[PDB]
């Protein structure tokens, strides 16, 4: 099963070739698309090696950099320039599509903060929709007339995108000026694309859980609703040090309440003869609370480090605080309604981000049956 | 078995003139007929070297040219002018036939869209009254203009014994999608790649189909349904090329089903992975047949020049030819209804209605009387 990536507008070029950078880094793949003499399928991602990529003013530099050989402002202008290419660009996917050997899924690398691809990418995962019905598709949207533009593609992504990992620039320039004192746009995305390429250890590297983009997805989301996760990566020792930093709110990657179900992996060498005694002093010290009506609990799995390049880890959680996020987006709108050929869509748009506001609200409830 | 080649029209020069320089080069031969020092059979298209061709302002052009030492606009001025010199021209073809050990085909290369038309309307006819054991193949083009064009269809229907389409307009899409052009001088450059790719399994002997003969009768099952399409994927083992073959950006056409397909692979890939994808291409349908006659898909394997990588040809025969017609058919009423006897026009009109019903009824599971 291969994964093919989508990248648009300004930001989704960027960190998607710093993506490229730090994935090409972790095999013996020379920048320019060679083996080099120096386990890890290298097929998933690459196809003989081109790498699945579909990129969407900065292109130009891209292809200035050394990895050459690795191949308005408005939402209604960004939506309609994706109908006036609607049959030019789609041909490349399909050729792309079919040329593969069985398609998994779809990673899209875009941003929603007001640019030509934000509505570029609405667009897109409704004919993804309407062509493919059976392709899963994930995207990795980032967060900031803004408020018009990032309300908008809620509406979009919330019933074509089967998952969904959040990522606001805010949360992360605390990071930025904590712990690397900054006081840039290629600065922090050097963190961004480390989330990414941990994300998919389990995919190419073959374990025994998880051997597939469907292995991670369907356990987290419990309905196609609430499909909304965030991300941890703590090494910025043992395994009782690295779940215990992934909890805290100065390290997750996002601006009563509970989790759902979380994910840890864990990609070093450590001893597994005591994971699960940490699993033990975080329960009894009760660091995390979950749901109480369905038995939630957390999951980890094991992997290996690229042997090329320390215990690292990632934790991928689905909590109901990301509800608050989504309260100050759409404050601001009701803000600019009363501001400032129907202006119909954008009714629809706030009234259906309104039922996943309550639909969240409502999983805290030890009543959320029926 | 040799096979003498007929030449007519502006296009049919055209794409002879750039089929035997594809040829020349894939052999050791110079362009001055002689033969370079630098196992592969010649003799079918050439005789100890000359090409077995027949030509007939553009013919000045190839005088000029390098390889000079190697040899109106109405339906009716085609099929009019053509009389007049019957004898003329047969002379050439009958003292070329006996001249030859024994002869086996007719390849003849004319566009259907001026005069290459009429001619070649008389020669059809007048080749199955004094050669009536000579298959007759062409690789006819297709583009006033739709009288002309479907007048030729009711001599193509019932005498030539093969036919290949190669229309320009879904040439023109590759020649603008994969090779971004906007001229002839470049699409015909596909077309002699087609061509000579199509009789690489003569010229190459292997363990089957060393005869125009083994060709035809395995794709044609009816004397009617004899219209074959084409496709090229080369523009890696043997499922990619097989898979790329049967998508529909590739074929040179702008329910529906095949009939007979035959597979040209001119790599070196091993033999030991052919039953293999054969077997996928079966299991994820990418194509289905008719559901009357056990249809059946076929793959050849040849050798690539080593004077001149994996390439792929595909021989089609798909009834979604029929739409091609439908155009034909469809201007012509227009054009009838717009402006001695007029009754030819008319009697070709019935029959061209004949081979379309005969396509539709092809996809029904009782296609048997
Ligand atoms: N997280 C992150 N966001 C970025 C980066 N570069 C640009 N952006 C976001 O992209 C937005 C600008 O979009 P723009 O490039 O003008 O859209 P385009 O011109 O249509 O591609 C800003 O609001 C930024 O928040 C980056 O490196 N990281
Ligand atoms: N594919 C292809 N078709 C051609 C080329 N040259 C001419 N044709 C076709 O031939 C037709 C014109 O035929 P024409 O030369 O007038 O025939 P003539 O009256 O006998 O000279 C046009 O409709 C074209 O479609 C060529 O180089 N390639």
Same mark, same amino acid.
């Given at each position: 099963?291969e994964? *093919?990536?989508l990248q648009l507008?300004?930001?989704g ?7 490229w950078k730090? @994935?090409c880094?972790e %095999? ?5 698309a060679i083996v080099?003499?120096?386990?890890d399928?290298?097929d998933v991602?690459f ?7 579909v990129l969407?003013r900065? *292109?130009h $530099?891209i292809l200035?950099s050394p990895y050459?050989k690795?191949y308005?402002?408005n ?5 309609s ?7 030019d660009i789609?041909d490349? *996917?399909d050729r792309?599509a079919?040329?593969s ?6 990673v899209?690398c875009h941003?929603?903060?007001?640019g ?7 667009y897109l ?5 309407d062509?493919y019905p059976?392709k899963?598709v994930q995207t990795?949207? /980032?967060?900031p /007339?803004?408020?018009?533009n990032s @309300?908008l593609?809620l509406? =979009? ?5 089967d998952?969904?990992?959040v990522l606001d620039n805010?949360?992360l320039?605390?990071?930025?000026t904590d712990?690397?004192? #900054?006081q840039?746009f290629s600065?922090?995305n ?5 989330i990414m ?11 025994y859980?998880?051997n ?13 609703? !609430?499909?909304? @996760?965030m991300?941890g &990566?703590?090494?910025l020792?043992?395994v009782?040090?690295?779940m ?7 390290? /997750?990657?996002v601006?009563? %309440?509970?989790?759902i179900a #979380? @994910?840890?992996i864990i990609?070093?060498e /450590?001893?597994?003869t005591?994971?699960?005694? $940490?699993l033990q002093?975080?329960?009894e =010290?009760?660091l ?5 009506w369905g ?5 980890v799995?094991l992997?290996?480090?690229?042997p090329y !390049?320390?215990? $690292?880890?990632?934790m991928?959680?689905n909590?109901?605080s990301?509800?608050?996020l989504?309260?100050?987006?759409? =404050?601001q &709108?009701?803000?600019?309604?009363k501001r400032?050929?129907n202006?119909d869509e954008?009714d629809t748009?706030?009234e259906?981000?309104?039922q !996943?506001?309550?639909?969240?609200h409502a999983?805290? =409830?030890?009543?959320? *049956?029926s």
């Open positions: 099963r994964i *093919i990536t507008g300004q930001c070029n960027q960190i998607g070739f710093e993506f730090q @994935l880094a %095999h013996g793949i020379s920048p320019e080099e003499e120096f386990t399928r290298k991602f196809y003989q090696y081109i790498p699945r990529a969407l900065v *292109i $530099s200035n050459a690795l308005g402002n939402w209604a202008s960004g939506f320039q994706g109908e006036k290419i609607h049959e789609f490349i *996917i792309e079919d040329g050997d069985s398609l998994e899924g779809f899209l941003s929603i903060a007001g030509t691809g934000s509505g570029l990418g609405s995962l409704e004919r993804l929709n062509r059976k899963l990795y949207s /980032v967060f /007339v803004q408020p018009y @309300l593609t509406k =979009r992504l919330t019933q074509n995108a998952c969904l990992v805010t949360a320039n605390r990071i930025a712990r690397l004192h #900054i840039s600065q922090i050097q963190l961004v694309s480390t390429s941990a994300s998919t250890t389990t995919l190419r590297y073959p374990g859980m998880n597939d983009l469907i292995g991670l997805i369907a356990s987290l989301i419990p309905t196609p609703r !609430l499909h909304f @996760l991300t &990566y703590t090494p020792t043992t009782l040090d690295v215990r930093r992934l909890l805290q709110p100065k390290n /997750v990657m601006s009563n %309440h509970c989790y #979380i @994910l840890n990609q070093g /450590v001893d597994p005591q994971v699960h005694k $940490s002093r975080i329960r =010290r009760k995390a609370n979950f749901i109480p038995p939630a609990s957390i999951q799995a992997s290996r480090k690229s !390049l320390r215990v $690292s880890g990632l991928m959680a909590h109901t990301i509800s608050s989504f309260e100050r987006t759409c =404050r &709108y009701d803000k600019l309604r400032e050929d202006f954008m748009s706030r259906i981000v309104q !996943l506001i309550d639909e969240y999983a805290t =409830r030890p009543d959320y *049956i």
